[PDB]
């Protein structure tokens, strides 16, 4: 199957650090880990980084 859990972004987000992902509503984020504390390890367009879990569809 896919290398991870694919989820849709619900809103645009602009990264506030170099280790966060920037994305737009409708992007498909690959989730690698559902880390505790509100930020998940994800991947988009060849970059690995943190995604705010409240910005992607469901949990």
């Amino acid at each position: 199957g896919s290398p991870g859990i694919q989820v849709k972004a619900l809103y645009d987000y602009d990264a506030q650090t170099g280790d966060e992902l920037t994305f737009k509503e409708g992007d498909t984020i690959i989730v690698h880990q559902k880390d505790p504390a509100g930020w998940w390890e994800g991947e988009l367009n060849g970059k690995r980084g943190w995604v705010p879990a409240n910005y992607v569809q469901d949990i």
Binding site: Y11, D12, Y13, Q16, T17, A37, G38, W39, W50, P52, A53, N54, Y55
Partner: peptide, 10 residues
Amino acid sequence: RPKPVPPPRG
């Protein structure tokens, strides 16, 4: 539409 606030990063 309005967005949730990102949670603390620390």
